[PDB]
Design a protein around this ligand. Sequence first.
Ligand SMILES: C=CC(C)(C)[C@H](OC(=O)c1ccco1)c1cc(OC)c2c(NO)ccc(N=O)c2c1OC
Lengths: 338, 56, 126, 273, 231, 212
Amino acid sequence: ELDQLRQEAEQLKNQIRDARKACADATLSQITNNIDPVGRIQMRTRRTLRGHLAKIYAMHWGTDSRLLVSASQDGKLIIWDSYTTNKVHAIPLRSSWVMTCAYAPSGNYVACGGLDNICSIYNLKTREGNVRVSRELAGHTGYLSCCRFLDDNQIVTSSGDTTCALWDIETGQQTTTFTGHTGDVMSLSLAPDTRLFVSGACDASAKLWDVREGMCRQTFTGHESDINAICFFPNGNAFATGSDDATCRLFDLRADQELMTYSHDNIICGITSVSFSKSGRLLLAGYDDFNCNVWDALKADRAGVLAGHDNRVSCLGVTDDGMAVATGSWDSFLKIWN
Amino acid sequence: ASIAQARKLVEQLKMEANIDRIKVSKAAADLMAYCEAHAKEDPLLTPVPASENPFR
Amino acid sequence: QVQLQESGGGLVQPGGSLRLSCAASGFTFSNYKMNWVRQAPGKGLEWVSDISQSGASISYTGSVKGRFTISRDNAKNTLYLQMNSLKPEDTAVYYCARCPAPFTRDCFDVTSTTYAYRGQGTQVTV
Amino acid sequence: CAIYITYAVIISVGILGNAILIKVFFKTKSMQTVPNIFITSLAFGDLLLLLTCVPVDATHYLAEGWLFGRIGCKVLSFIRLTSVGVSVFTLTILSADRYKAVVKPLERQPSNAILKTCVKAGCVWIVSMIFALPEAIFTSYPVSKKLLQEIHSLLCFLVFYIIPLSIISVYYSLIARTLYKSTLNIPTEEQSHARKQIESRKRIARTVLVLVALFALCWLPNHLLYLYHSFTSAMHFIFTIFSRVLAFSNSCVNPFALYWLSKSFQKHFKAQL
Amino acid sequence: VQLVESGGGLVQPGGSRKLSCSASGFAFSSFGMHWVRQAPEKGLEWVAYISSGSGTIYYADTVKGRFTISRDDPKNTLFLQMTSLRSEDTAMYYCVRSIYYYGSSPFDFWGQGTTLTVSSDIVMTQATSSVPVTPGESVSISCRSSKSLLHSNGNTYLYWFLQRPGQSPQLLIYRMSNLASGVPDRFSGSGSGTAFTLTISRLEAEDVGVYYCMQHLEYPLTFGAGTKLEL
Amino acid sequence: VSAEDKAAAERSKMIDKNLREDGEKARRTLRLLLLGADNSGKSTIVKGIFETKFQVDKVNFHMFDVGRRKWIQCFNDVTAIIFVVDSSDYNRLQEALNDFKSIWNNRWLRTISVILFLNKQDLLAEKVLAGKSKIEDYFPEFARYTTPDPRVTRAKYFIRKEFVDISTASGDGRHICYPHFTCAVDTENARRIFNDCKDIILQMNLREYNLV
Ligand SMILES: C=CC(C)(C)[C@H](OC(=O)c1ccco1)c1cc(OC)c2c(NO)ccc(N=O)c2c1OC
C-alpha cells in the first residue's frame, strides 16, 4: 500500500536523523574556537582576460595551472595562457547556449554543453593544427549543467533531467546512469581519487555516488533552496555546497551530516560558484551581488571580498597549486586574483 | 505507478540508514589537521614573495 | 530538510466550510512567499492563492475569489486557507507549495509536475 | 555695481555644476560609460572657460590695468579661446552622437569604442588649440589691425557660432521630429507604462529645443560685440558686461540639462552634494 | 600533412628562380612557414620565415634584399622568389611548418625538398661530426651555444632534428627536453643553458643519420654542423 | 619576450581580431524568446531549440523556442520576450496570466520588455457571439466591467487589461508590455515585432544616454 510505503520511508528518515543526532558531539565551531583568525585576505586582479562578447557561464583550470578554458554565451570557447593573457585557442560552438565547460587532466581535450542537451568533446592536439570536435555525447533529456573529465576516455555529466551520467567517449555510450535527484542537477565535483563524486540538485540536497558501482551512497540535506555549486575538500573527506538561500554549507562524508554554515545577515543573493583554497583553509564563493567572498572554512568568518566584477559572478576556480583564483562573470570578463 | 517509486525510495533509505558514522568531533579534528598540515604550501592563505609569484 | 505537511481536508456537503493547515519545517518561513495549489481529478495542477512574506500582498484565482481566505502565521510556521461555501467543482487534492527562493516575489515552477518544495497534499471532496 | 552679484552667482553655479558632474563621473561606477565621456569633456571645457573668464573681471574692472605678465596674459587668453572652442565643438559632437542614438537606434555600436571616443575628444581639444593658435601675440593685434583683425573676426564668428549652431540646430530638430513621431508608436492607453514614455519623450524634445534656443541667445551678443568692435561710455560698459555674462551663461546650462532630463543624474547630484 | 616543393633545377648565374610549395592535409593558415637550405655535403641553413597571415617576415642576412617569401593562404601555397642568384645558393630547399602558441611544437613537419643548382648571431658549435656506433649501444650527442638559450620565462629554446640518409629532417626534441609526437621514448634531451646533450638509450637501425641542433632564441635561426652516426 | 612568445602574441592578436569581427556580425541581429504555451499557436505567429529566423526592413531577427527556473536565465540579454496567449479558451486564461506574471516578475527578466500576442481573436469573437461560455464564470470582474460588436470589444479589452494590470503592477518603467491581437492568419506579426523591438531599443538608448 502507498500509505504503508510512505510510513516506512518517513520512519527510515527519522531513524537516519536520530543516528545523525547521536553521532554529533560538538560543532566544528567549538572545536575550532581557539584557532588563530585567518586575518584579512586581500587579493588584487593580476590579469583581466578580455575577449568574450557575452556573459560567461563556466571556466575550468588546466592541471598545469597556466591554461584555462572559458565558456561564453556568444558560442565561443577560449583557452587562455593566463601568464601572458594570450588566447591559445578560440573554439566556435554549434550551440551558443553553453552553460558548462571542462578541461581534461591530460590537457588534450575540452568539453562543453548546455541547452542542446549534448556534451561535445574537442581534440586540442591534432596533426592538422586545428581544434575539432571528437565526440558528441547524446542521451541526456535536459540541459547539461556540469561535466568533469575522469580521464581521456571517461567523463561525468550532470544534466537538467535530474540525472547524472558516466560516459565512455571511445564509443559515446552511457556506461552508467546515476538517478535519485528529484530536481535539476546543477553541478558536480570529483573526488581526488576519482572514485566518488557529489552532485547538487534543485531539490535542496546533495548525493554522493560510487562511479564504479553506480548508486548513491549518502544523501546530504540542510539547504533550504536550490543548490548551484559544489566542490570537494582537498582531502576528499568533505565538500561544500552553495545554494540560493544565500548560504554555503560544509558536509562531512564520514559524519554524514552538516559541519558548518557560511552565511551573513546582509547577504540575500544566491551563490553561483564555490571553491576551496589549496589547503582547504579558505573557501571562495561567488554571489549574485557581483562579488566573491572568501570564507575562513574552519571558523565561518568572512576573510575578504573579491570585488571587481560589475555583473553576476557565474564561475570561480582555483589553480591546482593554489597560486591564483580565476572568476568569470556575466560582464564577459575573467579576472585572475592573487 | 508511484508504488514502484515509493519502494525504490524505501530501499534507498534503508541502504543509506545502515552505514557507519564517526563522531563529528573526529571529523572536525581531521579537517583541522589537514588545514594545519598544508597551510605552508597554500599561496592564497600565506601570500608568496613576488619573486616566486607567476602573476606579477 | 524542507517539509510541508497538509491537514484539515475531508468530506463536506456543498455550501459547507473547511480549513486547511500547512505546517512547515526545514526552512525559515518568513522569507518565503507561500502558495496554495490544487489538482482536480483528471486535471493538472492549478494555482489557487498565494500570500507574500508578511501577508501584505494576497492574491486568488478568480474562480475562488471571495470564497477562500489565505493567511499565514510566521510565528508558528503554519499556512492556512479558510474555505467558505464549497462548490461541487472545488473537489481536488490541495497542495501547499513554497516559492523556490527567498526574498523574491516571483515563483516559478510552483504548479510543476514534480516541484520539489510542495507538500504531499490533502484531499478535499464534496 | 549691482550687476557683479549676477556675475558671481552665474560663475559659482557653473563651477559647482561642472564640479559635481565630474565628481559623479569619477566616483560613481554606474555613471561611467561611453556617452558620459563627451559630457565630462564638456564639463572640463566649461571649468576652463569659467576659470579663464573670472580673471578678466578680477583685473579689468576698476582702476586695475594689468596684473599678470605679458606671457601670463598671452597664455590665459589662449586657454580661454581653446576652452570656448572645445566646449562649442563638444556640444556639436554631442548633438551628433545623440542624434545617432535616437534617430538611428538599431545601429548599435558602443561596446569597446571607449578609445574611439577618447581620441575624438582629444582631437576636439587639439583642433580647439589650433584654432586658438592665431592668438599667440598679445589684447590681441594691438596696432595695424584693420584687415587681419577683420578676417580674424569673420572666421571666428563663422567657425564658433554659425557652423556649430547650424549643426546642433539641425540634429536637434531631427531628434525632436523623431521623438514626436515615435510618441504615437507607444501603446498610448493602458497607462503607467505607456503614458510615462510619452511624457518623457515629449519632455526630452522640449528640453532639446530649449537647449538650441539657449545656446543661440546666449552666444549671439558676445559675437555681436566683437564684430562691432572689429568693424570700427556708461551704456557701452554695461552692454559689454551683460554680453559677456550672456556668453558664459550657456555654460551653466550644460549640466542643468542633464540634471533635468536624467533622473539618475538627479539622484547622483542629490547624493553627492 | 604533406608539403611538396617545386621549381628547382639548373639556373644560370645572376638569374631568377621561384620556388613554390603546396601544403595539403592541415590548416595551412594557422602555421608560420620557414625555408631552410642544405648545400651538398653541408649542414642546414635557415633562409626566411613568414608569419601566420603574412604579418611578420624575416630573412637570413645572406639572402635579405634578394629573396622574397610570400604565401597564398586560399591556395595553401608558399612561394620564395629569388633574384640575382649567385654560385653559393645551390642547395636543397626545404619548406617547414611551425605553429607558435603555448606548448606548441614548431618545426614539426618538413617538406620533401627541391634542389636548385647554379653555375652578431648565436653560433651553435656541435664539435664532433662522426661517431661510429653499433646497434643497441647508448649514444650521447653533445652541443654548445655561444649565448645561453635559456630565457627569463624558463624555456630553453634548443631544437633537435634528425636527417636520415636520403630523407628530410625530422623533429626529435623541441625546446631542449620536449619529445616530439611520434618520436620513440628512447630519445631524451638535457642541458642547462649552453651545453646540451642528446641521449639515445637504445640505438636501432633507423637511428642512423646526421643529427642537427637549432636555436630558436633569436630570429636569425642557426644550426649546428651535425653529428653523423654510422654502423 | 622571445621569438616564440612574439609569434604566440601575434596569433593571439589574430584571434582577437577574428573574435571582434564575429561579435560585430552577431551584434546586428536581434534575439527573441518565444514563450507561449500549448494551444496558443505560438509556432504559427511569424511566417531541443526550435530556432526560426526572419528579416524585415533589412534587420535580422533570431527567435528561440525551447522544447524552468534555471534555463530561463540564459535568456536575459534577448531583445524582447514574445508571449503568445490563446485568448479563446477561458479555462487556461488564468494559467496564462500566472505564467505572464512569473515571467514579468523574474529577477533576471526584470529588464526585458514583453511583446504580448493575444492569439486567436477570431475564435474568441465566435465564442462570445455564441454566448454558450460566459467570461463572468471564470472572471467575476467581467460582470461589472464596462469598456472605456461592443460585446467582443469589451471582451478583448478586459482580456488585454488583465495582462496590462499584471505588467504595470510592477517594473517602474524599466520594461513595458506591448499587447497585440492576433488571429493566427494575420501576416503583420513580424512587422509588429520589429516596431516594438525598435521602440525597445530606442528607449534603451534614451536610458543609457542620460536622456530619460
Ligand atoms: C568666440 C569668440 C569671441 C570673439 C566671442 C571671444 O569671446 C569669448 O570667447 C568669451 C568667453 C567668455 C566670454 O567671452 C573673444 C576672443 C578674443 O580673442 C580672439 C578677444 C580679444 N582678443 O585678444 C580681445 C577682446 C575680446 N573682447 O572681450 C575678445 C573676445 O571677446 C569678444
